[PDB]
Design a protein around this ligand. Structure first.
Ligand code: FE
Lengths: 122, 99, 210, 125, 185, 85
């Protein structure tokens, strides 16, 4: 009952666009977007407010099908954002927004993929 | 880049593994270089490279191993740059005197 | 044997500079924020609007970033520092979110204080520690590195220990305290003109010398 | 006066050649103090560095120091001093001093004559 | 002539690596170990009174009788003091000797030429590809055991519509004439 | 639509790739089998297996990750978790 932080630590992995393997550490209850931003493979200024309204699919991550069964399914707003903010207006069926991925020990060890970054300045 | 001589059998083995990796990654380029797709069998080519490495096990000198790897890398670069029942005795006997 | 330097400044005719930029890192202070003249902000220090950095304290963010949020109060003679990496593998920059009151002799290093927090004096937060949102630590509490203070709780003791949960009425008073020290800081702020008159004194000294 | 050009395209004329040479020679002596005294390299370095420092201290004009030294091109002298600093740093980085014991060196001397018309580098006057 | 900086070197150079020295009118000679050749050339190039700052060339000599058949020779020149010096070592087929490309940038092509002709590999060469012989050459031509006419020859193969390489079948074999006199010794 | 290969397809492809070796046998190959012990192979055999897998799946495997592919289960997990396969 020491109430440390190592219990809340959730360790997962991320392969970015060019294929480099990365180790991502994030607290339980803090989103995958926040964990990736802290790791440094997502531009912090690109995505600041962890909200669906402020998300423009700049937090999109592709997750394996055997990991999609461990987190809640995509909401209608998330699916709409993925459909609209894409190169082609299709659903990738393996990608979820990093804002709605609430990290937990169930998802500990999950492997995600960071697609090619998109511009966000104006 | 050329490296100093390997001072350990483990280092020589690691260099051999790196060279085999390089050959395997450079194999598909040889496909478009030579165009023998009918009877190439890329898997058979990999098996032949492994067989060459396995027939070169009698060597135990790390210096000889490093020299062999250097020459193998040179040969890889050259190939990338496109530079190409009557017993055995009786056949040679019928062929010529010098055998 | 040690060799004293003859050209060593035993009197600088000016105290410690309030802002010490290291390399390209310039400490940033919001115009609304109040930092006392006695403080020393060195390196990667970022003080946002409404902050109340009180006299006698020091913020040395040379190793890693130090951030003071909106209406955050850091009181007199406290020390704030950071370092590369932490025992928890989380980012080790010192972050203090909005509506956080921090007592007099607080020793903060690589802490991650979430918004709306109360921290008493003589409180020490070593590397990797985070005090979650809406939490209180009383005076003298020291948290070991990597220890966390859960949200909605009161903690105490030289080794940090949970005392009791916080009622909603007690929780709502943390922003009130933050804005109260903010108002006191605003009262302190009005006594300083944009430019000091000490340059007249140094010119008088130069004229006296020649 | 000032040197319009040093002739060498790579070399460039330096105004404070005397000061640069003085500083380089002082640093040369300070660095060569770390070399063992028994070594002939240290003795030779101290000899020529002290001589050059003395002459460049006594003579003020760069023309005068060039004329007295006899090597000329204070820019070349500065380059030589910098190379000497680099060599001293290298011989501190690796330790070559001291005979390895049980050491043999084969000095070979033959007086086989050569004709006067073969290319032989004549000694400077 | 001009044996000044040679004697000065032997006076100032560390005695650890001077395996042997030769004072000759055909050229002053230093013979050292392959471990300390780079350090020796760095000392000579940088020292203020032995400034051999230009590398004339690097050569190889084959001596099949010796245990270390290859002899790597470095001819260097000092334009500041106007004298030539020679520094050589002994290397065999497998061992790799230190490279002096970092000191003298011109040494790259001569070291590649030495590799091509003899097989003496260098440790720190930026690249060590063959320079002079044909692409895919198998042997080292300047070795004494290497035949003068080589092992393969090229010709145009009409069915292949390309120049192919085949084992040598040359007519008018080389006629080695033994002119050596038994009284020459 | 679709960024990762199906787990069953990856397992079948990896099994088929392993089956195509002369030294190995279909009887002793299992989804959880160590290359050195269960399949009775060598270091060069494991390296060639990894290279064959990466050639079949069309993406380069990093050095350390390839070194950690000493089992069919590890290979399947890595291939199914990689977006470039
Ligand atoms: Fe998002």
């Amino acid at each position: 009952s020491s109430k440390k932080v190592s219990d809340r630590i959730v360790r997962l992995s991320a392969i970015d666009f060019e294929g480099k393997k990365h180790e991502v550490v994030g607290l339980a209850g803090h989103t995958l977007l926040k964990a990736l931003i802290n790791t440094g493979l997502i531009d912090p200024d690109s995505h600041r407010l962890e909200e669906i309204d402020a998300c423009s699919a700049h937090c999109e991550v592709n997750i394996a099908q055997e990991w999609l069964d461990k987190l809640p399914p995509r909401s209608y707003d998330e699916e709409y954002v993925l459909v609209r903010n894409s190169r082609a207006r299709v659903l990738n069926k393996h990608s979820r927004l990093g804002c709605q991925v609430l990290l937990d020990h169930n998802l500990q060890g999950m492997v995600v993929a960071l697609p090619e970054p998109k511009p966000w300045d104006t | 880049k050329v490296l100093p001589n390997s001072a350990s059998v483990e280092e020589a083995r690691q260099r051999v593994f790196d060279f085999f990796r390089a050959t395997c990654r450079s194999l598909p380029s040889v496909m478009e270089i030579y165009n023998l797709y009918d009877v190439t069998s890329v898997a058979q080519l990999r098996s032949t490279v492994a067989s060459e490495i396995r027939k070169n096990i009698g060597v135990s000198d790390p210096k000889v191993i490093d020299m062999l790897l250097f020459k193998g890398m040179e040969e890889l670069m050259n190939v990338v740059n496109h530079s190409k029942a009557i017993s055995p005795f009786l056949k040679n006997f019928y062929s010529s005197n010098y055998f | 044997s040690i060799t004293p330097s003859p050209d060593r400044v035993k009197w600088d005719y000016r105290g410690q500079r309030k802002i010490i930029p290291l390399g390209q890192w310039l400490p940033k202070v919001a115009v609304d924020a109040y930092v006392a003249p006695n403080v020393v902000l060195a390196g990667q220090v970022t003080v946002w609007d409404g902050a109340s950095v009180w006299p006698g304290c020091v913020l040395r963010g040379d190793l890693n970033k130090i951030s003071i949020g909106f209406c955050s109060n850091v009181q007199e003679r406290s020390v704030l520092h950071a370092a590369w990496t932490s025992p928890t593998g989380l980012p080790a920059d010192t972050s203090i979110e909005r509506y956080v009151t921090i007592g007099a002799y607080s020793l903060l290093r690589s802490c991650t204080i979430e918004p709306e927090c109360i921290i008493g004096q003589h409180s020490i937060l070593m590397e990797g520690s985070l005090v979650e949102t809406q939490s209180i630590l009383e005076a003298g509490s020291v948290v070991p590195p990597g220890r966390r203070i859960p949200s909605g709780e009161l903690w105490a003791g030289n080794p940090a220990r949970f005392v009791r949960t916080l009622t909603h009425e007690e929780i709502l008073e943390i922003p009130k305290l933050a804005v109260a020290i903010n108002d006191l800081s605003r009262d302190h702020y009005s006594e300083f003109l944009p430019y000091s008159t000490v340059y007249l004194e140094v010119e008088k000294f130069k004229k006296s010398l020649g | 006066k000032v040197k319009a050009s040093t002739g060498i395209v790579g070399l460039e004329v330096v105004p404070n050649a005397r000061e640069v040479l003085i500083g380089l020679y002082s640093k040369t002596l300070k660095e060569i103090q770390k070399v063992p005294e028994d070594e002939g390299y240290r003795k030779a370095v101290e000899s020529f560095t002290k001589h050059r420092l003395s002459v460049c201290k006594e003579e003020e004009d760069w023309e005068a120091i060039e004329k007295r030294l006899g090597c000329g091109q204070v820019e070349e002298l500065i380059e030589e001093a910098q190379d000497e600093l680099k060599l001293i740093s290298y011989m501190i980085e690796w330790d070559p001093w001291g005979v390895p014991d049980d050491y043999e060196c084969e000095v070979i001397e033959n007086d086989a004559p050569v004709p006067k018309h073969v290319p032989l580098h004549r000694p400077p006057p | 002539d001009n044996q000044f900086i040679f004697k000065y070197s032997w006076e100032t150079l560390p005695k650890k690596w001077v395996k042997k020295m030769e004072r000759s009118e055909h050229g002053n000679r230093f013979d050292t170990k392959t471990d300390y050749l780079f350090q020796l050339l760095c000392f000579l190039k940088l020292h203020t009174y032995t400034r051999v700052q230009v590398l004339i060339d690097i050569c190889g000599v084959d001596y099949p009788s010796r245990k270390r058949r290859f002899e790597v020779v470095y001819n260097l020149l000092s334009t500041r003091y106007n004298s030539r010096i020679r520094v050589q070592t002994s290397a065999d087929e497998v061992t790799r000797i230190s490279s002096v490309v970092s000191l003298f940038p011109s040494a790259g092509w001569w070291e590649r030429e030495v590799w091509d002709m003899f097989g003496v590999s260098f440790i720190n060469h930026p690249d060590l590809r063959r320079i002079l012989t044909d692409y895919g050459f198998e042997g080292h031509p300047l070795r004494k055991d290497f035949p003068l006419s080589g092992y393969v020859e090229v010709r145009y193969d009409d069915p292949e519509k390309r120049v192919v390489s085949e084992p040598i079948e040359m007519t008018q074999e080389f006629r080695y004439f033994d002119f050596a006199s038994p009284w020459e010794q | 639509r679709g960024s990762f290969l199906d787990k069953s397809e990856v397992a079948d492809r990896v099994i088929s790739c392993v089956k195509n070796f002369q030294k190995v046998d279909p009887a002793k190959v299992t989804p959880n089998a160590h290359f050195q012990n269960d399949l009775g192979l060598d270091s060069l055999d494991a390296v060639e297996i990894v290279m064959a897998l990466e050639e079949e799946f069309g993406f380069e495997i990093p050095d350390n990750e390839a070194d950690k592919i000493n089992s069919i289960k590890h290979a399947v997990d890595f291939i199914a978790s990689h977006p470039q396969a």
